[PDB]
Structure 1
Amino acid sequence: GPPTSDDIFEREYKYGAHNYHPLPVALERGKGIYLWDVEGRKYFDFLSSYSAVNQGHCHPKIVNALKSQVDKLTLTSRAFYNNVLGEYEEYITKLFNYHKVLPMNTGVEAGETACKLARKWGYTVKGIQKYKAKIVFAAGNFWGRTLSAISSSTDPTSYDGFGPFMPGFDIIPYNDLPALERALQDPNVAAFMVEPIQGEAGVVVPDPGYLMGVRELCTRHQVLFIADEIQTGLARTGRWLAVDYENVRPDIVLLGKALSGGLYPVSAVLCDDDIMLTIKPGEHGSTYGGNPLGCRVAIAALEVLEEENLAENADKLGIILRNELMKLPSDVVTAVRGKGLLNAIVIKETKDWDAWKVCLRLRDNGLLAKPTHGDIIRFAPPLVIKEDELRESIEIINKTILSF
């Protein structure tokens, strides 16, 4: 016979590392906003694979781009040229209005690249003494799991037991302009890296004006403003980039996750020549970075966001979701927050009943969501969701929450 859910759980427990704490559900198919488990049950996806399937699971446009290119050429490395990478480079730099892009594969690779750019520019353009360059981060940041990434983390689960840590990384509170201003008094700071909304920290939305103040302080003190839009970008919050809400232009922009619609690990580092060209030939790279397959996929994934106006849809539907969640009782759900279709609720955790239990019952009533910590549940469905489907989801959430 074919494996049950319990069979699948057991096999991974035996042959796979235990580095995740998954919700016990076993999926075999996805399409648009929906996932199906091996028992044939249907679920609303309200995680979107950490906002990587903004376009919905298996979008036909993106699938067709992948199938078309895989027959021709998939990997040359950048030791040679191919005919696709330049077409993608011209498309994406003109779309976001930066001189250049440096292609990578995963989100954390984009972040590492940005740190290297910041340091290189710091030493060769700004003139910092080697090797005294600093990069400032905000408390609660998440940008991956390399040794460098977790060195900037304030979450012990991320860094405990994995030191000694990368020097030159400082931390200030998020959503705190006086703290940024105090930090940038040090001329050895080369960059401030920040998420326009902190995702994995629990959808922490900064106050109106924060990003304007950030852009202002970074310009004033000759510091690069690095915007990590790997989770918040690409229509998820209701705009091409979440920084578009305050119409601010960062020095470096990071994209990933939804850049491929979930079909291929593609990430990108966008910035102007004065920054980008501090890195000379041979001084940075990646084997699969910029490969023609990922590029065809990324072009299609970006075109989907545009053609279907998913940003406008996320903006419209997000406020409906938040407004409805705000009707839940003040002492079962203690906060609602988000922008566009990146949202979260905080539940009054008891030692009897918590976010994990809510999510188990959400699963049972046909909706997949994951907690982060033990009192916050994230709601992030694919951006192709329609209003009637959203309202059905909302009913499921009401039903579940009010059932405890």
Structure 2
Amino acid sequence: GPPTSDDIFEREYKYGAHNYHPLPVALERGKGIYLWDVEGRKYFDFLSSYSAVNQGHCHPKIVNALKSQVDKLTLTSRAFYNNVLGEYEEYITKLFNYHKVLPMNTGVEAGETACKLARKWGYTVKGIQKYKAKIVFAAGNFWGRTLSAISSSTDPTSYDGFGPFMPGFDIIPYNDLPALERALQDPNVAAFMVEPIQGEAGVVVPDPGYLMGVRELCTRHQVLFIADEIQTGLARTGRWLAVDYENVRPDIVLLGKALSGGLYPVSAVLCDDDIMLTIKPGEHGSTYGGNPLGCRVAIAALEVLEEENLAENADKLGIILRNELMKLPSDVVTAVRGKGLLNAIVIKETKDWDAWKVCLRLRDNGLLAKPTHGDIIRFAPPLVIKEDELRESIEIINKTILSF
């Protein structure tokens, strides 16, 4: 017969690396806001694969683009041109109003690309001596698992045991304009990379005016503002980009995750010519970056977010979600935070009761969510969810929280 859930956990234990400890649920099917496990149980997805399935699981329009293009051509490499990449490049640069895009595959590769752009612009345009360029990051950041990405982390689970670390990366507190102003006094700083809302730090929303103040200070001191929108971008917070809430234009914008609707790893680095063209032919890229299959998928994924007005839906339904979550007793849920459909609750963790136990019981009651920190639970369902579906989910959350 087909493997049970326990079989599935045990087989991965034997033959796969132990780099994750997932919540014990074994899915085999996803459609829209729902997931089904191998026993046939149905769940609400309140993680959305960290924003990658904003459009819902297996969105038919995005599937159709994949199935149409896989019959024509999937990979030429960049040794030649394929016919899809320029159509995608025109579409996304016009959509976000930047001169150019550099295509990559995973979110961390977009971050690496942005660090390379910042350094090469710092040396060739700003006039920093080679190799004294610095990049500033905010404590709590997470942008992936390469040696460079963990070198900017303050999370020991990211960096401990994996050094020595990349030089030239400085760290300041998040949501702290005086600290950024102090860091940018060094003319060897080339850029500041920052998430408009910190995802893995626990959905940390900075104070109103932070993003405008970051833009003002970067401009004043001739520093590039890199906005990592790999989780916050593409409608998840209720705008096309979370920086749109303060009408702020970063110098470099990073996209990923929902760029493909979860059907393909596609990421993107957006900026104008004065930054982009510091990288010359032969100096950067990726085997799969800009391949025609990912590009057809990304065009469709972007079209879905536009045609279905998913940013408006995320905004309106996020307000319902936070308002209803705030009714839970303060002695058990100590904070509700978020924008759009990127939200989190904080739990009054005890000796025995923690975020992991809440998420186990949420799973028992038909809802899938992921803990972090032991007292933080993310709530981020796909943006195609409807109000009726949202309210049923909240009832699952209430039932679970109040069952303890």
TM-score, normalization: structure 1?
1.00
Deviations 1:339-382 (A, max 9, x none): 00000000000011110000000000000000011100000000
Q: CA–CA distance in 1 between the matches of 2:178 and 2:135?
A: 17
Q: SS where residue 27 of structure 1 aligns?
A: strand
Q: CA–CA distance in 2 between the matches of 1:307 and 1:2?
A: 39
Following superposition, the deviation at residue 393 of structure 1 comes to 0.4
Following superposition, the deviation at residue 392 of structure 1 comes to 0.2
Deviations 1:1-57 (A, max 9, x none): 110000000000000000001000000000000000000000000000011000000
- The corresponding residue for 1:82 is 82
Q: CA–CA distance in 1 between the matches of 2:358 and 2:130?
A: 51
- The corresponding residue for 2:97 is 97
- The corresponding residue for 2:348 is 348
Q: SS where residue 185 of structure 2 aligns?
A: coil
- The corresponding residue for 1:292 is 292
Q: CA–CA distance in 2 between the matches of 1:73 and 1:152?
A: 38
Following superposition, the deviation at residue 287 of structure 1 comes to 0.1
- The corresponding residue for 2:14 is 14
Q: CA–CA distance in 2 between the matches of 1:399 and 1:254?
A: 38
Instruction: Give ranges in structure 2 of 5+ residues lacking alignment.
Output: none
> What aligned pairs does 1:366-377 form with structure 2 within 5 A after superposition?
366-377=366-377
- The corresponding residue for 1:212 is 212
Q: CA–CA distance in 2 between the matches of 1:372 and 1:21?
A: 12
Q: CA–CA distance in 1 between the matches of 2:276 and 2:23?
A: 41
Deviations 1:225-274 (A, max 9, x none): 00000000000000000000000000000000000000000000000000
Q: CA–CA distance in 2 between the matches of 1:69 and 1:391?
A: 38
Q: CA–CA distance in 1 between the matches of 2:275 and 2:50?
A: 29
Q: CA–CA distance in 1 between the matches of 2:255 and 2:177?
A: 24
Q: SS where residue 36 of structure 2 aligns?
A: strand
Q: SS where residue 122 of structure 2 aligns?
A: helix
> What aligned pairs does 1:223-372 form with structure 2 within 5 A after superposition?
223-372=223-372
Q: CA–CA distance in 1 between the matches of 2:73 and 2:395?
A: 47
Deviations 1:117-152 (A, max 9, x none): 000000000000110000000000000000000000
Q: SS where residue 113 of structure 2 aligns?
A: helix
Q: SS where residue 378 of structure 2 aligns?
A: strand
Q: CA–CA distance in 1 between the matches of 2:158 and 2:362?
A: 27
Deviations 1:92-117 (A, max 9, x none): 00000000000000000000000000
Q: SS where residue 10 of structure 1 aligns?
A: helix
Q: SS where residue 101 of structure 1 aligns?
A: strand
Instruction: Give ranges in structure 1 of 5+ residues lacking alignment.
Output: none
Q: CA–CA distance in 1 between the matches of 2:334 and 2:56?
A: 30
Q: CA–CA distance in 2 between the matches of 1:227 and 1:178?
A: 19
Q: SS where residue 343 of structure 2 aligns?
A: strand
Q: SS where residue 391 of structure 1 aligns?
A: helix
- The corresponding residue for 2:397 is 397
Q: CA–CA distance in 1 between the matches of 2:247 and 2:351?
A: 44
Q: CA–CA distance in 1 between the matches of 2:285 and 2:83?
A: 19
Following superposition, the deviation at residue 401 of structure 1 comes to 0.3
Aligned length: 404
Deviations 1:135-172 (A, max 9, x none): 00000000000000000000000000000000000000
> What aligned pairs does 1:39-78 form with structure 2 within 5 A after superposition?
39-78=39-78
Q: SS where residue 129 of structure 2 aligns?
A: coil
Q: CA–CA distance in 1 between the matches of 2:37 and 2:62?
A: 23
Following superposition, the deviation at residue 190 of structure 1 comes to 0.1
Q: CA–CA distance in 2 between the matches of 1:22 and 1:7?
A: 15
Q: CA–CA distance in 1 between the matches of 2:49 and 2:82?
A: 31
Q: CA–CA distance in 2 between the matches of 1:296 and 1:34?
A: 25
> What aligned pairs does 1:376-395 form with structure 2 within 5 A after superposition?
376-395=376-395
Following superposition, the deviation at residue 218 of structure 1 comes to 0.2
Q: CA–CA distance in 2 between the matches of 1:347 and 1:331?
A: 9
Deviations 1:266-306 (A, max 9, x none): 00000000000000000001000000000000000000000
Following superposition, the deviation at residue 318 of structure 1 comes to 0.2
- The corresponding residue for 2:203 is 203
Q: SS where residue 343 of structure 1 aligns?
A: strand
Q: SS where residue 56 of structure 1 aligns?
A: coil
Q: CA–CA distance in 2 between the matches of 1:178 and 1:228?
A: 21
Q: SS where residue 43 of structure 1 aligns?
A: strand
Q: CA–CA distance in 2 between the matches of 1:81 and 1:22?
A: 40
Q: CA–CA distance in 2 between the matches of 1:103 and 1:9?
A: 35
Following superposition, the deviation at residue 216 of structure 1 comes to 0.2
Q: SS where residue 253 of structure 2 aligns?
A: strand
Q: SS where residue 3 of structure 1 aligns?
A: coil
Q: CA–CA distance in 1 between the matches of 2:158 and 2:105?
A: 21
Q: SS where residue 350 of structure 2 aligns?
A: coil
> What aligned pairs does 1:93-132 form with structure 2 within 5 A after superposition?
93-132=93-132
- The corresponding residue for 1:31 is 31
Q: SS where residue 357 of structure 2 aligns?
A: helix
Q: CA–CA distance in 2 between the matches of 1:211 and 1:373?
A: 26
Q: CA–CA distance in 2 between the matches of 1:26 and 1:283?
A: 42
Following superposition, the deviation at residue 81 of structure 1 comes to 0.5
Q: SS where residue 30 of structure 2 aligns?
A: strand
Q: CA–CA distance in 2 between the matches of 1:42 and 1:270?
A: 38
Q: CA–CA distance in 2 between the matches of 1:21 and 1:51?
A: 20
Q: CA–CA distance in 1 between the matches of 2:311 and 2:21?
A: 31
Identical residues among aligned pairs (%): 100
